[model samples]
Target: GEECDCGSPSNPCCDAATCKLRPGAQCADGLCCDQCRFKKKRTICRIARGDFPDDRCTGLSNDCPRWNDL
Candidate 1:
């Protein structure tokens, strides 16, 4: 039951699994982080910080790396 539920930063699903948001998000097929991952842990900044960088990671909270994750 380890899921990265970053739909709400205050609670990322994987924190239950020690995980984060979703960009190339594919830990457990959109649910949890099972023992089936291999250097494929990425986040989409459920809470984005910074002043809008591009056509992504906007309309989000200012506290994630995606605000400048590129």
Candidate 2:
């Protein structure tokens, strides 16, 4: 009998435990860009424009002028 490699990079249930036993990973979550459906959207890298740096001139810049009103 041929064995299926569930741990393959292409498989949804390959690496992360949260993404285990899932099917068809074809969506971009917060942390992971191309994660499977089974994997919950992680907030590790889900920073909005306001949450980003404003400018290099000021080290305390926390305004997103590019996306918001100046």
Candidate 3:
């Protein structure tokens, strides 16, 4: 999705007009983001999805580690 998608009623983290992240916003929304910023390294980012395993942030991206065996 867009850098952030805090849909409707406008959000401080995302810009409704551009649909991009706001200034100083490391991340607007995601399992690995909170309060307009990325979650701490090693923080859980993805919960188990069926056969998938939980994943964490590594400070490399705003998301969990890429699928190892999807």
Of candidates 3 and 1, the better by TM-score: 3
- Candidate 3 CA-lDDT value: 0.68
Give a tens-digit lDDT track for model 2, residues 1-70: 3223234555543444444434454332213333433232222333345755332222122222232334
Per-candidate TM-score against the hidden true structure: 0.16, 0.18, 0.57
Two-way lDDT contest, 2 vs 3, winner:
3
In model 3, which runs have C-alpha deviations exceeding 4 angstroms?
Answer: 1-9, 47-54, 66-70
- Model 1 RMSD in angstroms: 10.8
Badly placed stretches (over 4 Å) of model 2 are 1-10, 13-23, 27-30, 38-42, 46-70
Best by TM-score: 3
**Models sorted by TM-score, best on top:** 3, 2, 1
Each prediction's RMSD to truth? 10.8, 12.8, 4.2
- Which residue pairs does candidate 2 place in steric collision? 25-36
lDDT of 2 at 47: 38
Report lDDT (CA) for all predictions: 0.36, 0.34, 0.68
Better of 1 and 2 by TM-score: 2
Ranking, lDDT, top scorer first = 3, 1, 2
